[PDB]
């Protein structure tokens, strides 16, 4: 679990990257 | 985590490859 609790964090920050790219593109 | 922190980087550069192929095709 703790060695593989980072996959969820990378998925979370990747969803954040997609929301930021989408929202960032809308702002631009 | 650090042994598997490369899966996120490969996914990132693969998304970059898709954006570059899409954008590169548009430029061509």
PDB file of C-alpha atoms in Angstrom:
ATOM      1  CA  UNK A   1       0.000   0.000   0.000  1.00  0.00           C
ATOM      2  CA  UNK A   2       2.401   2.786   1.015  1.00  0.00           C
ATOM      3  CA  UNK A   3       4.801   2.008  -1.813  1.00  0.00           C
ATOM      4  CA  UNK A   4       1.747   2.091  -4.118  1.00  0.00           C
ATOM      5  CA  UNK A   5      -0.024   5.011  -2.433  1.00  0.00           C
ATOM      6  CA  UNK A   6       1.865   7.219  -4.900  1.00  0.00           C
ATOM      7  CA  UNK A   7      -0.040   5.960  -7.939  1.00  0.00           C
ATOM      8  CA  UNK A   8      -3.169   7.607  -6.596  1.00  0.00           C
ATOM      9  CA  UNK A   9      -1.283  10.838  -6.005  1.00  0.00           C
ATOM     10  CA  UNK A  10       0.128  10.834  -9.529  1.00  0.00           C
ATOM     11  CA  UNK A  11      -3.372  10.210 -10.907  1.00  0.00           C
ATOM     12  CA  UNK A  12      -4.670  13.072  -8.750  1.00  0.00           C
ATOM     13  CA  UNK A  13      -2.025  15.518  -9.942  1.00  0.00           C
ATOM     14  CA  UNK A  14      -2.584  14.353 -13.520  1.00  0.00           C
ATOM     15  CA  UNK A  15      -6.285  15.126 -13.213  1.00  0.00           C
ATOM     16  CA  UNK A  16      -5.170  18.467 -11.809  1.00  0.00           C
ATOM     17  CA  UNK A  17      -2.912  18.955 -14.817  1.00  0.00           C
ATOM     18  CA  UNK A  18      -5.823  18.255 -17.165  1.00  0.00           C
ATOM     19  CA  UNK A  19      -8.134  20.643 -15.292  1.00  0.00           C
ATOM     20  CA  UNK A  20      -5.391  23.297 -15.253  1.00  0.00           C
ATOM     21  CA  UNK A  21      -4.626  22.891 -18.962  1.00  0.00           C
ATOM     22  CA  UNK A  22      -8.358  23.056 -19.802  1.00  0.00           C
ATOM     23  CA  UNK A  23      -8.999  26.031 -17.466  1.00  0.00           C
ATOM     24  CA  UNK A  24      -5.643  27.642 -18.422  1.00  0.00           C
ATOM     25  CA  UNK A  25      -6.562  27.343 -22.156  1.00  0.00           C
ATOM     26  CA  UNK A  26     -10.008  28.884 -21.410  1.00  0.00           C
ATOM     27  CA  UNK A  27      -8.308  31.790 -19.535  1.00  0.00           C
ATOM     28  CA  UNK A  28      -5.896  32.364 -22.480  1.00  0.00           C
TER      29      UNK A  28
ATOM     30  CA  UNK B   1       7.157   5.195  -5.378  1.00  0.00           C
ATOM     31  CA  UNK B   2      10.511   6.277  -6.841  1.00  0.00           C
ATOM     32  CA  UNK B   3      10.865   3.099  -8.874  1.00  0.00           C
ATOM     33  CA  UNK B   4       7.300   3.759 -10.101  1.00  0.00           C
ATOM     34  CA  UNK B   5       7.613   7.542 -10.410  1.00  0.00           C
ATOM     35  CA  UNK B   6       8.697   6.880 -14.004  1.00  0.00           C
ATOM     36  CA  UNK B   7       5.283   5.637 -15.116  1.00  0.00           C
ATOM     37  CA  UNK B   8       3.908   9.125 -14.619  1.00  0.00           C
ATOM     38  CA  UNK B   9       6.783  10.601 -16.595  1.00  0.00           C
ATOM     39  CA  UNK B  10       6.251   8.176 -19.467  1.00  0.00           C
ATOM     40  CA  UNK B  11       2.535   9.026 -19.469  1.00  0.00           C
ATOM     41  CA  UNK B  12       3.439  12.729 -19.474  1.00  0.00           C
ATOM     42  CA  UNK B  13       5.828  12.411 -22.405  1.00  0.00           C
ATOM     43  CA  UNK B  14       3.284  10.240 -24.220  1.00  0.00           C
ATOM     44  CA  UNK B  15       0.662  12.955 -23.831  1.00  0.00           C
ATOM     45  CA  UNK B  16       3.333  15.311 -25.133  1.00  0.00           C
ATOM     46  CA  UNK B  17       3.900  13.002 -28.089  1.00  0.00           C
ATOM     47  CA  UNK B  18       0.175  13.023 -28.868  1.00  0.00           C
ATOM     48  CA  UNK B  19      -0.037  16.821 -28.600  1.00  0.00           C
ATOM     49  CA  UNK B  20       3.085  17.168 -30.766  1.00  0.00           C
ATOM     50  CA  UNK B  21       1.809  14.735 -33.402  1.00  0.00           C
ATOM     51  CA  UNK B  22      -1.585  16.509 -33.470  1.00  0.00           C
ATOM     52  CA  UNK B  23      -0.021  20.013 -33.530  1.00  0.00           C
ATOM     53  CA  UNK B  24       2.788  18.835 -35.876  1.00  0.00           C
ATOM     54  CA  UNK B  25       0.158  17.390 -38.301  1.00  0.00           C
ATOM     55  CA  UNK B  26      -1.795  20.702 -38.124  1.00  0.00           C
ATOM     56  CA  UNK B  27       1.436  22.653 -38.900  1.00  0.00           C
ATOM     57  CA  UNK B  28       2.186  20.348 -41.891  1.00  0.00           C
TER      58      UNK B  28
END
